[PDB]
Design a protein around this ligand. Sequence first.
Ligand SMILES: COc1ccc(NC(=O)Nc2ccc3c(c2)C(=O)N([C@@H](C)CO)C[C@H](C)[C@H](CN(C)Cc2ccc4c(c2)OCO4)O3)cc1
Length: 250
Amino acid sequence: RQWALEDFEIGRPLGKGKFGNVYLAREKQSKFILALKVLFKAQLEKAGVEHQLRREVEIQSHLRHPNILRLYGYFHDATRVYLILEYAPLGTVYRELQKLSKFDEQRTATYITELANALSYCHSKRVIHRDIKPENLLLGSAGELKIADFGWTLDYLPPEMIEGRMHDEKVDLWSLGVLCYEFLVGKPPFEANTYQETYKRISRVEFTFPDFVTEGARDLISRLLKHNPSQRPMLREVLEHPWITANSSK
Ligand SMILES: COc1ccc(NC(=O)Nc2ccc3c(c2)C(=O)N([C@@H](C)CO)C[C@H](C)[C@H](CN(C)Cc2ccc4c(c2)OCO4)O3)cc1
């Protein structure tokens, strides 16, 4: 699948990202519309993240899911590594959230459902994501969630990772709690002005609800944000939550 830059007409800047920029592109021969992520080798080598890249690629070979952004391939020159990506035409969840400033229960419960399907899949293939947050979420052509990475900024991290203790896949369930809160409220539950205070707030699981968050929503979030990883629900228990089943379209 020997690709090169000449195989693509590059288009509109989609934005700055990890270690470089993403652009819209069309493949000359098929006219297929994609995103092209330019990674500068200088930043990757000077960050020492060749391993995470190799992992990403390897995971992308074996794993595919409708709520996980596809990587079709990659190629090199002297300077840059180029990632050829599934194009997500409704953009980032972060952009949507800034616009609406927060999401209704229907939109949240749906998003949470799609994400739980993504993770539930991921976990069975022995993959813990560890990096779900609104900045890492895109939207496909029908408004469906797309996780940008396969993964591996304290706000979304659970106590066990904050402190450096042993952690498993319950990590991602914490993150889903955080995400669920932020979707409804418009900011993450442990937000603070310094790194140091945010750490303290997470250590001690200090979150409060605004009055407009409903009893069903508090129930699911309260259950995901337990200090004890083993007290956090299974992904199926999320998918079968009465607040989820009520509000979700998917
Ligand atoms: C170092 O080893 C790795 C490991 C994984 C990767 N993969 C990777 O970089 N994938 C990727 C794919 C899409 C991305 C990003 C990152 C990225 O850089 N993000 C930022 C914000 C923080 O991680 C995640 C966002 C979802 C970002 C959205 N942006 C920049 C514009 C954009 C808009 C629409 C898009 C699109 C990209 O791709 C398809 O449709 O789009 C790269 C190097």
